[PDB]
Structure formats: structure tokens, C-alpha cells
């Protein structure tokens, strides 16, 4: 945990939406961004999955918005920790949300 534990936040802060929350204290975060193609002068929508540690101080369900901070390698695929959660309402339609 970044508050009661022994890790430090340093580097880049990012925002994303919750994609899955099945592991004990970990989640998968979805990030959305745009890619430009010069030949056609148009864009493509791309997304990536980023895993993070979720401390027991936060309650999170799918579709929520989270702020993640960079930490040292905590496992094979984890280098981020959750530091803020904003709830999202019920049955809200999935939307493309760059952040």
C-alpha cells in the first residue's frame, strides 16, 4: 500500500478505467488513446491494458475511473499503484474516454 506500506510513488501519473477486478489485491486498467496515420490524414483508436495493485482502502467496480502512480517492480506485470477512485454510475454506456 502507498499509504501504510513501504513503497514510494515516483514518475508518471495516469488515468484510466477499470476493466477487471478479480485478483486478490490487483486490477486491470484500460487506457485509451489516439494514433495518427499521415498517408490517410486520419486517426485510429487504440487501447492498452495496465495492471495495478489495489489497496484495501479503496472500493472499486468495473467502469470506475482511477488514478495510478508509478512504483518499483512489485511483480512480473505490475509497476503501478492506485491512489484515487471516482465512482461511475449504474448501467452507464461504455464510452471511448481518452485521459
Amino acid at each position: 500500500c502507498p499509504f501504510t506500506g513501504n513503497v514510494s510513488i515516483r514518475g508518471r501519473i495516469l488515468r484510466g478505467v477499470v476493466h477487471s477486478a478479480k485478483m486478490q489485491r490487483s486490477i486491470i486498467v484500460r487506457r485509451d488513446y489516439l494514433h495518427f496515420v499521415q498517408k490517410y490524414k486520419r486517426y485510429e483508436r487504440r487501447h492498452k491494458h495496465v495492471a495495478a495493485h489495489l489497496s484495501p482502502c479503496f472500493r472499486v467496480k468495473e467502469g470506475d475511473i482511477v488514478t495510478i502512480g508509478e512504483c518499483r517492480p512489485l511483480s512480473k506485470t505490475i509497476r503501478f499503484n492506485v491512489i484515487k477512485v471516482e465512482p461511475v454510475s449504474e448501467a452507464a454506456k461504455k464510452r471511448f474516454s481518452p485521459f
Binding site: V37, Y40, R42, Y43, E44, R45
Partner: peptide, 11 residues
Amino acid sequence: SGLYTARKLRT
């Protein structure tokens, strides 16, 4: 001809 259609044109 949409602004976000580069992938389809490439394919």
C-alpha cells in the same frame, strides 16, 4: 471517409 477510419482503409 470518416476521420477515424485509417485502419479500415489500410486493411
